[PDB]
Structure 1
Amino acid sequence: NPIPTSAVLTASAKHIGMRCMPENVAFLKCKKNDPNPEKCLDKGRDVTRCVLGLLKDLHQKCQKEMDDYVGCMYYYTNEFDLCRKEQEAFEKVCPL
């Protein structure tokens, strides 16, 4: 449901970095070999679909505790150390 904006993606990067690891590694290896966007096209959809699935899962499982996290991250321009309150409120319900 959420649009993959800057705030949501930065907020959920913690969960992306442990569930999207193989797809991200594959895309990075593909991009390193050749800079062609055309050649990296096919691997550029696997990561997109897996990240969107993760965002859907996080939105459904952690609904109220993620909207406030995204709102505060957008408010403070993605600075983790400032608030952090909705942060632990977020991994409290999402177990990562």
Structure 2
Amino acid sequence: PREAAAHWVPFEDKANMPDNVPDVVEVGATSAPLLSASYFIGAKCKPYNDDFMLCREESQGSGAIDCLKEGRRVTRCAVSVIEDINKSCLDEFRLHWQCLEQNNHQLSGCRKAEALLNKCVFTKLNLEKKIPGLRPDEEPVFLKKDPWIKPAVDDFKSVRAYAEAKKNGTL
């Protein structure tokens, strides 16, 4: 789909969902927290995402109205992972997405906060960040030390928290 052209107006629909359709919660995170959580959401909700997409393909044109129950599962799984993050690892998660908000949403600008977030999420949620499709020779970039590309200003709070974790021994 193309973006709107010369003159357009936004319009809101005031109707409710038809009552036959079971209601569902909606994800409440904005773009930066979602980008921060995306790999954990992928790790946990891969089967449901795959099932939703397979349903959409198999519906062959009626996918929106035929996969609503699969979509309901997808959104519930995403809400569950974000709730778990908000219960166990909120400080580090906030570090990471505030850093992202300062760095044009570039993950390369936030590696120190991401290291703490990954350790927390792995220890208390048993989710692991992993980049699909690489050979064992190829090194995932988020694990690389001494990268070519670095942020203009390493984030202040993140630098302090990273050094403190290195003292404590958590990281």
Tell me the number of residue pairs that the alignment of Structure 1 and Structure 2 aligns.
95
CA RMSD of aligned residues (A): 1.5
SS in 2 for 1:53: helix
Q: Cα offset for 1:3?
A: 2.5
- Mapping 1:29-68, distance limit 5 Å: 29-34=54-59, 35-36=61-62, 37-68=64-95
State the Cα distance separating 1:83 from its structure 2 match.
Answer: 2.3
Partner of 1:19: 44
Q: Tell me by how many angstroms 1:76 deviates.
A: 1.7
Percent of pairs with identical residues: 29
Task: Give the match's secondary structure for 1:31.
Answer: helix
Mapped to 2, the partners of 1:82 and 1:65 lie a distance apart of: 15
TM-score normalised by L of structure 2: 0.52
Q: Following the alignment from structure 2 to structure 1, what is the Cα–Cα distance between the partners of residues 102 and 56?
A: 33
1:7 aligned partner: 32
Q: How does 1:67-82 map to 2 (within 5 A)?
A: 67-82=94-109
Gaps of 5+ in 1: none
| C-alpha separation in 2, matches of 1:76 and 1:26 | 34
* TM-score normalised by structure 1 residue count: 0.88
Q: Which has the higher contact order (CA 8 A, sep 6+)?
A: 1
Give runs of ≥4 in structure 1 deviating > 6 Å.
none
